[PDB]
A paper describes a structure:
We show that Balon is a distant homologue of the archaeo-eukaryotic translation factor aeRF1 and is found in 20% of representative bacteria. Unlike typical A-site substrates, Balon binds to ribosomes in an mRNA-independent manner, initiating a new mode of ribosome hibernation that can commence while ribosomes are still engaged in protein synthesis.
Our cryo-EM analysis revealed that the ribosomal A site was occupied by a previously uncharacterized protein. By contrast, Balon lacks both the NIKS motif and the loop A and instead has a distinctive HP motif that directly binds to the decoding centre at residues A1492 in 16S rRNA helix h44, and A1913 in 23S rRNA helix H69 (E. coli rRNA numbering). This binding strategy allows Balon to stay 10 Å away from the mRNA channel, facilitating its unique ability to bind ribosomes independently of whether mRNA is present or not. In the absence of a P-site tRNA (state 1) the lasso loop is poorly ordered, but in the presence of a peptidyl-tRNA (state 2) it is stabilized by contact with the 3′-CCA end of the tRNA.
Numbering used by the authors:
A (entry chain Sn): 2 to 89
B (entry chain Cl): 2 to 273
C (entry chain Ba): 1 to 44
RNA sequence: CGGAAGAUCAAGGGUUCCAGUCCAACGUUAAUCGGGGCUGGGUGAGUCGACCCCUAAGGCGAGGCCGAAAGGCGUAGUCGAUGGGAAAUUGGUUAAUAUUCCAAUACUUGUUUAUAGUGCGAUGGAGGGACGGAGAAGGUUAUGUCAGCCUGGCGUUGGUUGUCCAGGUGAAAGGAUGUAGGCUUACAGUUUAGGCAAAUCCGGACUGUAGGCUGAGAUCUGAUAGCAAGGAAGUGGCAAAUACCAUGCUUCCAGGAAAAGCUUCUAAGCGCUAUAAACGAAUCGUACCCUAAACCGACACAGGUGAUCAGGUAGAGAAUACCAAGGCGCUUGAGAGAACUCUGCUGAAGGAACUAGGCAAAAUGGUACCGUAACUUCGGGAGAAGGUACGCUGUUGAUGGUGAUAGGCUCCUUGAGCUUUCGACAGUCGCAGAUACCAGGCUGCUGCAACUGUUUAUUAAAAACACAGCACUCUGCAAACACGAAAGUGGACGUAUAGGGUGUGAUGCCUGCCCGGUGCUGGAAGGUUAAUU
C-alpha cells in the first residue's frame, strides 16, 4: 500500500559522516522506521524523492544510550538508519 | 591364541592379548550398523542403577541375526569380524539372493563355507535347526527359549550346550552353568560351540585397559564409612558383620532366584 | 581462583527463564508469587 | 614486555568506543587527565556469524500406558549445537566501521521471461555425506634471510666513494593447468528367493568386450593494483613450519556420531534438462574490552578465564637471554641511608659441631665419547658411580641437500652458487670456552605399598583409595541386581568365557587346624505354631 511508505523515513541524519557521504558519494542517510526493510526503504525513497533511483540500501540498528537525568536512570529510543545510494 | 607382551613397561608386564590374524581388518558392513551411545549405567531416572559403567570407546551396534529365519536359502561366509558388542566373533553371511547378515560365528567356521537355516540342514557348524532335528549329543550354541524369538542362551565366546536327550516336546539341555533344563523341541539351535574360545585366557595388564572397556573402579564396602555401606566403619581394618551388598543383601551363598512361572523348566543343577 | 558464578545466557534462560517457569506448575507458582509481591523482575 | 604486557575472536559485559567540554564526587595523591560528569557522534554484508536446512546427548510429547490428586513415563513426532549443510579476495578510506563503504577482479544461489528437447514426481529404496588412536616418509607453502634493484647518505673522534652505510622494494581470491603424492580395472548385455510395495537405481548370479578419479604446490592469467622521500624499485639463491597435500599412507585394538543437504530410482499421481536475458538474495549481529581497570572474584583486586596468529639472533625448542612490529613504566611522591623486618650478593678458618630432622641454603647440571656394581621379573637397575674433550684462527679430508651451466610441471650425466654434517693437523688468548640466561647432586642399609594413577576444594597425598590379578557366592534371561508408587527403565539390543555382590590385591613361594557360636546351603521324622473354621 501507499500509506505505509509515508512512515518509512523518519527524517534525515545530519552529522559529519552523513555530510561527507553526501559530498563524496551522493548517498543520503535517513533515520527510518524500526521495522522497515531495505525494499521498503528503496520504495519510500523513490516515491518521496521523485526522479531518483536507488542502487543500494544499507541499514543498521543503533541501540539507544542510557542518560541518567535527575534522580532517574533512563534510556533513549533505539533507532534504525539507512544509507541510501542514488544514481549519479 | 594368547600373546604375552614384553615387560618393556610395568603396565605391559602382564598384558596377554587374544590375537586372531584371520579376522577382518576392515570396517563392518555399514548397512547392518546402528548408533549406540553409552549409558553410564543410568536408567531413565538418570540414576545409577548399575555401578562401574562409564567411559570407554565409542562403538556401533552390529545387528545380529539371532533368529535365522532365511530358511532353505544357502549363505556363504564372506568374512569373520571382531565385534565390540560381545566376546564372540561375528560372521558376515552372504545369501544366494545377495542379502547380507551377521551371525555369531562358530569356532569351526571359516570364510567361504556354506551355512543353512531350517529343518533340512546338514549338521555342520553354523547351521540353524530346530532342536527336534538335531541328533542327541551334538554340541550346540545360540539356544532359543521361546519359539521364534531368537537365540538367547549360549552366545558368549566359547559357549557350548550339551543336548542330552528328550521327553515329549522338550529337549533336555545341559548348560555351561552346570544346569540341566527343558527347552521346547520347536526352539532352534546352531551347531557347534562359539568362536573365540580363548577369550577367558586373556589378561588386561593395567587399570587403563579396564577403563578402555567402559568399566569404572570398584570400591570395597569395608573401605567406606557406615553411612555408605554395611561394611563401613571401624578403627583400622575390620569386617565385623556377615558379608553383604550395599543394600544389605548377603553375598556369600544366599540364593536370590525367585521365579515360579519358569521353575518347571529346570531339571536340576550340579553340585561342586 | 575460579568462582561460583560463571555466567552463560543460554544456561540462565534455560534453568531460570520465563518459559522454564511456565513449563512447570511449581514454576507458575513462583511466577504467581513474584507477581503478588509486585516484583519488577519476574524472571531472569 | 615481546608464545606478550602485541594482534584476532568466542564467552561475559553493554557504549566502556570517538570527539568536544567540565573537575565537585569517583580515581587509594594532584590532575588541566580518565573506563568520571555533560553534550554530540559512531556499528553499513547474497559471500563473516546468526537466523535458516539437519540431526547428537537430552527435552517436550495427538493418541497410548501408569498413578489418591498433583503428576510419572512413552510412540509417531517435534525441539535441541558444542557437530553436518552455498558462496571473495586484495588495496584504499573515518576521529571513530569495514572480507560490510569505495576500487578492481571474483564466486554462490534463486525468480521471471523466452528458445528448444523431453516422462516428471517422495517424508520411501540405494549411494553419498561419514568421521578412531598412534606413527612415518616425503612434497610444499606461509614465512625468514641474503642478494639484486630503487632512493638517500659521505658522518661532531682515527678511518669511511666502497667488497661502504641506511631506508624502501616480493599483489590475493579466482580462471586455466593437472605436477609431487594418493586411490583405482572399464564398458555393454542376460537374468533375479534380496533392498517392507515398485524400480531402468543398488545387491546377487552369469556372458562378452579391454588410462580414469583425486590432488598441495609451481607456472601462466588475474596484473598497466596499491605503496615514499616530491613523482622509484618490484627479481634471484638459500633456509623453512606444529599450516597444506592429508578425511591421505602405514600399523594397532580399546574397533572409531547421526541426520540432512547432494546424486540416482521408482509409488500414488499428473513438470524436468540445457541456452541465455533481465531481475533478486530478506531479517538480526557487527562499536569497544576480551592473560582484562570493561568478564568471574564486594575494589581500577598480584587470583581465574576457551580458541586463534606466532618476526629476528643464539638455542632442540612455543625453554631461556636479548631485540622487532606493536604496546607499556603497572594513579602517591620527595628525602634519609639508624635499629629491626623482608628479598638478595660476598664471606677468613672450620665444615652439620646446627637442628626434632642438613629445614633452609650451598652444590650438581649441556653435548660427544669412554666407563659403569650388587640385584633382576632379563625389560631394567643406568644419566648408576666416575672420567676426558669443548673458545677463537688458519689449513685440510670426507659428506647430505638444492640446483645455474652445458650435453643427450618429463628423464639421465655434469656439476656454478648457496647451504648440512662429521673429522684431522697447526697456531692462539685468558683464572676460567657447556664462560651469560638456562641446566640431574650422588651413594650404602632398612620398613611400607608391586607398579602409572586417586584422595580430605581451604592445615593430612600417605603405608589410605584404585589397580591389573586371585577366590568365594549369586544369576537360565521377563536373570540376579538397581531406580521407580506403578508404568517405564538401567543391567543389555548383553546371555554363565556373561552379568551382579563380597573379600583379597602385580609377581615368586604359598596359604595349616576348628562347623561348638552366628550366618549360609540342603533335609523334614518329630515337637511347637497365624489368620481362618
Amino acid at each position: 500500500n501507499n500509506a505505509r511508505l509515508y512512515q518509512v523515513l523518519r527524517g534525515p541524519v545530519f552529522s559529519e559522516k552523513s555530510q561527507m557521504l553526501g559530498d563524496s558519494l551522493g548517498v543520503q542517510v535517513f533515520k527510518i522506521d524500526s521495522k522497515a526493510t531495505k525494499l521498503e526503504v528503496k520504495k519510500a525513497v523513490e516515491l518521496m524523492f521523485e526522479g531518483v533511483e536507488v542502487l543500494k540500501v544499507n541499514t543498521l540498528n543503533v541501540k539507544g544510550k542510557t542518560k541518567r537525568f535527575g534522580k532517574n536512570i533512563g534510556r533513549r529510543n533505539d533507532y534504525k538508519k539507512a544509507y541510501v545510494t542514488l544514481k549519479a | 591364541p594368547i600373546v604375552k607382551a614384553k615387560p618393556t613397561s610395568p603396565g605391559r608386564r602382564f598384558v596377554e592379548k587374544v590375537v586372531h590374524p584371520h579376522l577382518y581388518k576392515g570396517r563392518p558392513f555399514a548397512a547392518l550398523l546402528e548408533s549406540k551411545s553409552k549409558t553410564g549405567g543410568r536408567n531413565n531416572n538418570g540414576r545409577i542403577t548399575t555401578r562401574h559403567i562409564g567411559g570407554g570407546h565409542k562403538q556401533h551396534y552390529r545387528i545380529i541375526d539371532f533368529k535365522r529365519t532365511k530358511d532353505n536359502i544357502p549363505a556363504t561366509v564372506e568374512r569373520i569380524e571382531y565385534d565390540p558388542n560381545r566376546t564372540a566373533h561375528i560372521a558376515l553371511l552372504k545369501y544366494a539372493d545377495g542379502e547380507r547378515r551377521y551371525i555369531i560365528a562358530a569356532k569351526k567356521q571359516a570364510v567361504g563355507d556354506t551355512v543353512m537355516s531350517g529343518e533340512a540342514s546338514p549338521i555342520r557348524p553354523g547351521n540353524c535347526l530346530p532342536l527336534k532335528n538335531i541328533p542327541l549329543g551334538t554340541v550346540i550354541h545360540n539356544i532359543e527359549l521361546k519359539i521364534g524369538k531368537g537365540a538367547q542362551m549360549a552366545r558368549a565366546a566359547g559357549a557350548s550346550v550339551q543336548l542330552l536327550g528328550r521327553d515329549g516336546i522338550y529337549a533336555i539341555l545341559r548348560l555351561r552353568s552346570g544346569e540341566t533344563r527343558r527347552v521346547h523341541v520347536n526352539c532352534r539351535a546352531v551347531i557347534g560351540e562359539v568362536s573365540n574360545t580363548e577369550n577367558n585366557l586373556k589378561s588386561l595388564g593395567k587399570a587403563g585397559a579396564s577403563r578402555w572397556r567402559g568399566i569404572r573402579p570398584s570400591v570395597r564396602g569395608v573401605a567406606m564409612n557406615p553411612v555408605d555401606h554395611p561394611h563401613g566403619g571401624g578403627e583400622g581394618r575390620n569386617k565385623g558383620r556377615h558379608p553383604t551388598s550395599p543394600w544389605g543383601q548377603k553375598s556369600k551363598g544366599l540364593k536370590t532366584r525367585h521365579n515360579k512361572r519358569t521353575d518347571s523348566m529346570i531339571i536340576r543343577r550340579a553340585k561342586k | 581462583m575460579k568462582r561460583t558464578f560463571q555466567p552463560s545466557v543460554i544456561k540462565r534462560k534455560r534453568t531460570h527463564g520465563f518459559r522454564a517457569r511456565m513449563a512447570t506448575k511449581k514454576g507458575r507458582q513462583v511466577l504467581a508469587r513474584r507477581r503478588a509481591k509486585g516484583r519488577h523482575r519476574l524472571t531472569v
